[PDB]
Amino acid sequence: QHPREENSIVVELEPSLATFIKQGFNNLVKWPLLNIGIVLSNTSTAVNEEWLTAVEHIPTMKIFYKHIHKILTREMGFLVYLKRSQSERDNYITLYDFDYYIIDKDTNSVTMVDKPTELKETLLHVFQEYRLKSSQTIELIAFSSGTVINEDIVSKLTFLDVEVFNREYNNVKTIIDPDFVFRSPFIVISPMGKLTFFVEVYSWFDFKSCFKDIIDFLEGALIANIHNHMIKVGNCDETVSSYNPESGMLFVNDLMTMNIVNFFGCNSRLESYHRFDMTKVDVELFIKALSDACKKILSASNRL
Amino acid sequence: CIFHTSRYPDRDSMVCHRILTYGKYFETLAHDELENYIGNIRNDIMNNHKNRGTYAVNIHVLTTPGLNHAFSSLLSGKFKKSDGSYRTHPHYSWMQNISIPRSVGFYPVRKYHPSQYLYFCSSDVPERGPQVGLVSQLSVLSSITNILTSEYLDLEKKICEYIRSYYKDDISYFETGFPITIENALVASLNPNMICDFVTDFRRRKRMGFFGNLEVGITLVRDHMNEIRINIGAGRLVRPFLVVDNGELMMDVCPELESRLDDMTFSDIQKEFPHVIEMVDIEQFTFSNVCESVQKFRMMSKDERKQYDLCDFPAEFRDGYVASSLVGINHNSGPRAILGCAQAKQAISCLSSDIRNKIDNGIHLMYPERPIVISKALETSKIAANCFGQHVTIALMSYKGINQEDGIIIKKQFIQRGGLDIVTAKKHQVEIPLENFNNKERSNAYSKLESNGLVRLNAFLESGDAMARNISSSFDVSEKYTDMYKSRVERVQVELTDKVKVRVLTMKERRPILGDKFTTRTSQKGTVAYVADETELPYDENGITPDVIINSTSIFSRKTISMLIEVILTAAYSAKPYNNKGENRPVCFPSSNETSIDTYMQFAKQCYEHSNPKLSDEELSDKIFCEKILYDPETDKPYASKVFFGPIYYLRLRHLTQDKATVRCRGKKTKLIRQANEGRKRGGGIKFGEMERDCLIAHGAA
Amino acid sequence: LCASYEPESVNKFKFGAASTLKRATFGDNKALLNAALHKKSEPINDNSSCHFFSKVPNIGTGYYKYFIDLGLLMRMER
Amino acid sequence: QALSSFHTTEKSGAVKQKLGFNEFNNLTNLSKNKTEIITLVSDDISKLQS
Amino acid sequence: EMDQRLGYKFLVPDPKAGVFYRPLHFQYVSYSNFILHRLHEILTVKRPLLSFKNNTERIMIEISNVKVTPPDYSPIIASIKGKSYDALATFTVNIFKEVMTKEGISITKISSYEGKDSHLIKIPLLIGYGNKNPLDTAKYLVPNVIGGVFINKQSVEKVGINLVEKITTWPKFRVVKPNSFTFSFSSVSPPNVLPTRYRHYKISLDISQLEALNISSTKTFITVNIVLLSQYLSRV
Amino acid sequence: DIKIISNNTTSINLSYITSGKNNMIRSYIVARRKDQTARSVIGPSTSITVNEVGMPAYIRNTLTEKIFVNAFTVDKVKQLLASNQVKFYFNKRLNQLTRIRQGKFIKNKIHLLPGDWVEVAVQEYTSIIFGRQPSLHRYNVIASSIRATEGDTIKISPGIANSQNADFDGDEEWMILEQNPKAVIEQSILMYPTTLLKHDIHGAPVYGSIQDEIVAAYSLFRIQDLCLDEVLNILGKYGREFDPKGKCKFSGKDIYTYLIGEKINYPGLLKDGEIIANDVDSNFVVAMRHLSLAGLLSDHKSNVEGINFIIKSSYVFKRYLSIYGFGVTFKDLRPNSTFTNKLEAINVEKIELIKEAYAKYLNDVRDGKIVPLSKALEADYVESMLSNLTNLNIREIEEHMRQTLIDDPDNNLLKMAKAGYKVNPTELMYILGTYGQQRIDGEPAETRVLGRVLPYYLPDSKDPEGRGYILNSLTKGLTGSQYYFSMLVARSQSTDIVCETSRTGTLARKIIKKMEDMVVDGYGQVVIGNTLIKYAANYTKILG
Amino acid sequence: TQSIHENKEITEILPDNNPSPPESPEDRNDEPPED
Amino acid sequence: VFQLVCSTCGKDISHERYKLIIRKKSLKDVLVSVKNECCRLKLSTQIEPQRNLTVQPLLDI
Ligand SMILES: [Mg+2]
Ligand SMILES: [Zn+2]
Prior knowledge:
This is part of a larger assembly, with one copy of chain A, two copies of chain B, three copies of chain C, one copy of chain G and one copy of chain H. By secondary structure, chain A is of the alpha+beta class. Chain A has eight helices and 15 strands. A five-stranded antiparallel sheet of chain A has the order 3-9-4-6-7, sandwiched between helices. In chain A, α1 runs antiparallel to α7 and α6 packs antiparallel against α8 (about 285-300). The two termini of chain A are about 15 Å apart. By secondary structure, chain H is mainly alpha-helical. The longest helix of chain H has 9 residues, at about 35-45. The relative contact order of chain H is 0.21. The interface between B and E is large, with 113 and 93 residues. β3 (about 105) of chain B pairs parallel with β8 of chain E. Bound molecules: magnesium ion and zinc ion. Chain C: This is DNA-directed RNA polymerase 147 kDa polypeptide.
């Protein structure tokens, strides 16, 4: 078999419920990117921007798979550090040449994590011809999107030279964008009630446990959001979904309301008026259906 | 010519002109400067003799030959009555290094004369401005001749000896014969009854290397002017042609050539199989009978075949190297071909191997890809190897009525991951008096400077920062950075002399934003109208969302048919990208195609059948035609009908929004009239012209 | 074009009593010299003449003349 | 109309008045001492034949 | 499909003929022919300047010892440092009077100058394929570089086009006025004649005046009837 | 004036001010550069109506607007000064301008009195003047309300694109801000887009729908079986007032009747507020068309109603596109090779027939059997035969369109044809049929050396293909020689475009200068200077 | 398309392609007399 | 040869890239495990540009 295998998980559900789950997953499950990047030294043949844009999208979940939950709740961060020079043999850079650290985010502890050996067979950059007289080296560090760079965290970087880091960070800090940057861990769709996950399975860890952690996080968040959903029962301001009992008309203007009412017989779009009886909505029934769907999803995942 | 004017070569015909190359400029300047030098020496000696005695030669007149200023002016862009021979290289694209040195310029004629066909590219000409119809591009098979003086003399001697030896008794008619000229110099007069033989035997001997030169031109003019012309001089346009001899295509009577071709070069073919190919110049071409294609030749009867002297190569060899970047131009409207040639030279590429060394302006592509639906010329010239775009997934549909009038939709995650990312690099230069540079006083504009008075490496400069200390003595008089976007300092070079010279190279990466400009290889250009999130885009059954959405109507109203064929072939390649031997196999779709659409469809069908042997007829048809069902992400339901959907090589153009934006609140004035000054880099104001004034009066707003 | 007793081209001002500044704006390049030679005295009504002296053209809202009646203000007492 | 090539030139055997920008410019110029196109219309053809 | 293969054969390089990159080949040679051969022929001159008495007393100017050398740094160094990329050419000049004597040739020197160590001539040099110039016969090629540019004094890259010559190879016909025509042509010396000589001629024919069918020029030839001139030249 | 004696026109002297086109008057007096101005690339926006314009942040953060000091505004000015929001102050009594630098400025120098003003950052719904060059007519320069938008581009509604002759492939537009109170009132009334709705001469609306919207309109009128939920999904935010009288199924005609909320008649289009034509096409919804619905609504009440209809109908058309989609595919054009093969065979046969007939005539003339024709008559006969062949191709294409419509009623390309947007039998003939004769100055290309155009044909050739009759279609692909004639036509067109661009501007300026001073007087008459040009302005003494 | 009031139709004249906006600039007797 | 994910769909392609560029396996063998059209194109057509060594020092006086 291969180090990486592409797989699919398919489940059949009520169309509105499948859409609800898909949109919830895309809105709530956010894996941070390595967009806080500082180049400390660069005498290679590639400019800083190429290195930084490439490193921003390292697939890090296959390394930090033991800390998924806390990473998804943003109680824990991570960083990567690279320092590599030309060599006579193996004159290239793999993902095994990095060092990976986890950040507690409460005590600001920085701790090293284990590296799978399969990472030795990945490729990032190939050096030019080796010349002893001249130098050809790269050194850089990158933090995940939500991290705050202050003296407290900097004091823990005992593997670096703090003066160089301070200088280069002061150089680059102005172009780092301030908002949170993330990716979706895998691809999720639901064409006509057919909920499908396109995922990648690696040889060195069990994918089912990681999938279960993600699904549990999603289910908890979705139930919490459902419990706190309110529909204004006054007049329509054309900005939020609302219900007029005088006319008995519902103005649908958000996705959760759309999916819930469609689950109970409506056929609405995202900015539309409809004649719907609000007494037909039963939140507990919807929550029970969601829980059953999550159990079914986990069962489908188990049979890979 | 008095009685039949239209049958005599026109003054705008290429038959009566020759072309100057790089070395000829230098040769002419050397000639003129040497003559001026000798003239000045003579005048000085004469004046010295007139005033003084002994014929004394003054010094300071025999130490300045004047070649230095002549050459400097030449490179500056002045040459006799022309001012366009040389220019500063604009570093837009790699292919420009081919495009510009293969251009031919004409003195101020704008109509497309027939004599330009087959030797110049039909579609590569300026589309607007003062140069419209005045600059042409050589075809990939055309060349301009060179020859040395000694070679010239030897060739002329051999030709004259041949004439005087093999035709001793029939070269002194002078009353009813055909005059024979070499470079317009009359040397004999041939008996009319023997004209044909003389030409045929000549050409044969030309192809065997008898005269020591394979590019000699011989023309037989017979309408009623009755001349035989021989041309050997430099500056002539020449191409290879297939030989037809006595109604017989020689290529078809050389069985060994087919087996031996793979191991031979062009000169080997000329040496070992003469009479298969002949080098022909434009004047000889204009007076010959040439069959347009081998296929057309094979369909004629022998008597018909006997009327022809040459046969032509396929049409793809009649385009230039720039037009060879396009696909299937003969399946589209011609105006689109002109536009496509214009915008191909503005596509961002792997400009230079010295990106980190050269201190110059430039734009560089970041994660390049090599095109795989190409022509042979694009491969031999190395334009393909240096890349000018990326393969992206497109859909042809209307997206909520947003992508209208050439606007496009682009995906946010595609941009985030590096899709069609570029880097712009700029050069800055200043000269400073030594006292000002060493002057010891911190102004707010010096925040990026080091203790040595120079900007720090890897710092980002803003719109008010200085690059080097320049104080006039207690006032700051330094130049300032004046771009609306920041840039990183990549390199600094300093020269210390009576003055201080500082050169700085800066770089900035520029991910696509609203207003940036893109295009395809069929001239479908547009700007970014909306950046859409991945969750807002329609998707197919495999979960794929398009990177770019283009409105479909413009494909059919402008009749750019070859875009659809390009998408079909790119998908076919993606299904099966390798040979039976497992080697990477590009697909050949030349400009001036000549291959049927049905053959391409069959090739695509074979690729898909190799990929997945078990496909239904409907699925196979959908794959061949690149049609898919897409789903609305808001409701997860299919659209009414299937959508054209697939990959294509997409180009980014050098027109960026933040390079054009301008705004002024208040600023400097001109001294004489006391009105707002001009210049984007100097904070000038926009001009309110008199046509705008007309409009305001038409509104009645006094 | 036929406002006078004879047709007149669009390239010239022959029969119309166009002012000197109007002709100069049109592009005569000798109108001022000839006007000085003939001692011409002219009113200021054309759009070009109004633009030259920063006056409001007699177009649209500018076709009328505006006054202020202070009668009611002066009949009010503090 | 000029910039879109709206008007297409045609060949004719008899004197005609052309369309497009050039003819409008000629009309506004009002140049003298040039030939003019004169049209004769009748219901008796002998007068025209002479 | 044999014609397509033969066409492809022209586009690829031909090492046996010295063609390493077809698209720009003709330009390379064009410059190589000038710097290596034609410059020497133009400069190497030995000409009279003035004559006295009767072809026995004349001043003569001679130029010889023409040498051209390339720079000592690569074009990338020239770009970085801000220098220029020029070859250096030097030559020696002699001015001497000659008196023709029955005993043979008498030579009396007047002046002599040399440029052995001086920027006597600076000639911009063509970078060429692989950042390799025709003067330097090195053995290293920078990959993915095709050249075709110059670097000027201010370290700015320059590039040029080709131009159509003013002199035509066929006579020009023109209708001067109704039943009055002209036919103008030019004549130029062969390449091996220094300095080059030019002549421009015009033939005029007017139906009203057939006796004045005249060939003429400007201050270089007589105005004569072309038929009578042909009789004079050919004796027919 | 050095030109009195010499002939050089480069020296500077007194006359330089009135030398040529670069006069001082026409470069600095009737035109000039201005302070509060901007320019940028444009893009579309569906959140902006025809009455509005979107301004990028980098412009909002530089341009400034004026607040005059008087009894009504003094407290607001004091608050703005306290909040560090004032950028400039002007003392009118001393004619002095002061710039309030952040962290450094003068307090005692600011004593606000009536007639002074302050300048702050420009605010939303302030009017601004903007346009696209060249400014050929009135609608290229208009005043609109500012809305804050994202990016660095200026955003316009596609509803005004036609009136400015604008598209989104790199066009730029310019802005100016004028804040004198009289100018503000004039901008708010006279230059507002709602006031400009109806064209001055022919009276049709100058704003409307474009491109795929047209097809949407055509489709919306034809959809038949809809439940109330689907109707309301289409109507979106305009569905609040929809009245489902007693029905359960609805048609597109019902939607159109609701959109036209008025019971009016017009021969042809309308009867009691309902469309009675067979279909809705370009002439109903596009700008500058003679059957516009917005035009009828404006005639009935006022321009406000017309502008409202334009906004609402555009919104619903785009919602239809969002729900159902639209796109043309390659299969719509060429499902298989049957029809193209048939037409190609027809052309191959007919051209050979024509050549044989011509050869027979030439052979008869070459002998003593008939007197030859004139050159002109011979050319006319050959041209007639070739034109007949082209007309045969046209008829074949029309029959094919009809048959395809019968067999495949939902063909999107034929939908474009039916709705009246860019597709017709001639264009389809070019794609699938034949190209036909190429002409320069109304004639085929002239012969030049041996009585021929290219050496692919024998001397004195009589082959029509050798003089620009192209047999192939675009799907087949043109040959090299055919491509020559095609490019001849294309390049001649481009060159003529440049020359005409040069000449038309000169003529236009002369005419504008000549007619500039002709106005309507106070009695409805047309006068220039002191001369009466016409008794009744538009024959009616009513607005044109 | 259909015909309703064809005698009052208005014909559209609008170029499809327009030029992109401008950008800032940033004797040997060896010639014919040319009479 | 430099990005670690597909720009179109975001899938990980670093392992196949090592298998292709360093081990020099056949394109068919490499693609055996890659299904999406976009990823196959990226692996088949992406290159690392040709470049010279950087001239040092970067700041020179
Ligand atoms: Mg445009
Ligand atoms: Zn992919």
